[PDB]
Amino acid sequence: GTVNWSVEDIVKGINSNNLESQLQATQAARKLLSREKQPPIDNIIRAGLIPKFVSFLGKTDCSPIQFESAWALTNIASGTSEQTKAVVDGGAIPAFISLLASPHAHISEQAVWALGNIAGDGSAFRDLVIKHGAIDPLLALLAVPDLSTLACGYLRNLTWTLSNLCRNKNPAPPLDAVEQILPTLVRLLHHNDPEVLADSCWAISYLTDGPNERIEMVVKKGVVPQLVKLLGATELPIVTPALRAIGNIVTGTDEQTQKVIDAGALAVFPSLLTNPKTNIQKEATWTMSNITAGRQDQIQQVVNHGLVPFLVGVLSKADFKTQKEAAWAITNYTSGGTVEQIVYLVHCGIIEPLMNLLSAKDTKIIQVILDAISNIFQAAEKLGETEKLSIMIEECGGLDKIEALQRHENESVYKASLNLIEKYFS
């Protein structure tokens, strides 16, 4: 019936001035644009059909052609930036926002979907969707006493479109738009559907990726305990954005970091730092590196939770980018820690795996490690035990590599190298 029309036939039906003929041709376009392999988006655009689809969105007496054109335009907007731009250039944004009030749930859902693709293109179209007034009718669709009464796919699409309004930077979303959205986001973050939970976590992770004032807006809504709970979920698609959000938060102030610790996050890190998915291990070790960049009482919590042996483990064996985050975690720890905390680090076995990574070709991890070694020597100076540490570095092959590195391309590596040799390996 409407399966496998040519673009030419679709144009012929849409141009016919027969509403039923246009309905059939629009559904045929929708089916073309729904195929997985190379949907002919550019052919449909080039045929001039977008203005016709956009005007079909306004045909209140023919709800099927509203749906079919909404779906067709949704799938054009799912393409490249240029393809999304063609949809926007045709006036689709206010027409889709009007459709959010449709009494037909499947049509308002399709308009939700299309706006998420438009907003998802980037900051400018995101902000353009916001300027046309999308946030109020979107949030009104969720203004029910219990989210559980909404259809499952409908709630998932709303959550995802809201997360695209929270997404992207340069610039970040408008402050007042974020404040308007956050209470609904908090509510979606406590819903029981794993996809809603994943996309809510993604939205929170976007909002916390920025300056401390952005983080504070989120942290002040009291969501950190729920994020920490989600950090322990069995579903990787929930854990991943929950961990990104938690990691983003601990790039903030010491006080924002303390809320993550107060909520119990560190008890999850034995699992996260040994997680089979290397991206989780990396994100978790980066998070740890920013926590060890904190106050001594926060470093002490890392100690109390037994997490220093887990950092030794990741330093000893992990994919290289995780190992580099572990090196950063160690230099931050030795930079801000007490003498006792640094002594404890050595007793846990940090020295040998630290030395082994001096074989890495990455110039910055060598700098990070040399700094850590200098920081540890400075603690051993305060104890008169430099010699015991030099022997430790020498027995594990480390002095061989610190002596090699004084003939290194980067001048700051060469300098840090010879300084270590002069003062501690005379």
Partner 1 sequence: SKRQRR
**Binding residues for partner 1 (CB under 8 A):** 34, 36, 39, 71, 74-75, 77-79, 84, 110, 113, 116-117, 120-121, 160, 164, 167, 209, 244, 247-248, 250-252, 286, 289-290, 293, 328, 332
What is the distance, to the nearest Å, from the Cα of residue 310 to the centroid of all Cα atoms in its chain? Answer: 24
Q: Which one, 168 or 390, has the nearer CB to partner 1?
A: 168
Q: Which one, 249 or 358, has the nearer CB to partner 1?
A: 249
Q: Which one, 237 or 397, has the nearer CB to partner 1?
A: 237
- Radius of gyration for the alpha carbons in the chain, expressed in angstroms and rounded: 28
| In the complex, least distance from residue 209 CB atom to partner 1, rounded to whole angstroms | 6
| In the complex, least distance from residue 295 CB atom to partner 1, rounded to whole angstroms | 12
Q: For residue 414, with 0-12 CB atoms within 10 Å meaning exposed, 13-18 middle and 19 or more buried, which class applies?
A: middle
Q: Which one, 113 or 310, has the nearer CB to partner 1?
A: 113
Query: What sections of 250-277 are H helices per DSSP?
Result: 254-262, 269-272
State how far the Cα of 169 lies from the Cα of 205, in Å rounded to an integer.
12
| In the complex, least distance from residue 71 CB atom to partner 1, rounded to whole angstroms | 6
| In the complex, least distance from residue 156 CB atom to partner 1, rounded to whole angstroms | 10
| In the complex, least distance from residue 105 CB atom to partner 1, rounded to whole angstroms | 15
Q: For residue 128, with 0-12 CB atoms within 10 Å meaning exposed, 13-18 middle and 19 or more buried, which class applies?
A: middle
Q: Which one, 202 or 269, has the nearer CB to partner 1?
A: 202
State how far the Cα of 125 lies from the Cα of 119, in Å rounded to an integer.
5
State how far the Cα of 407 lies from the Cα of 200, in Å rounded to an integer.
51
| In the complex, least distance from residue 292 CB atom to partner 1, rounded to whole angstroms | 11
Query: What sections of 5-104 are H helices per DSSP?
Result: 7-14, 19-33, 41-46, 50-56, 63-77, 81-89, 92-99
Q: Which one, 74 or 341, has the nearer CB to partner 1?
A: 74
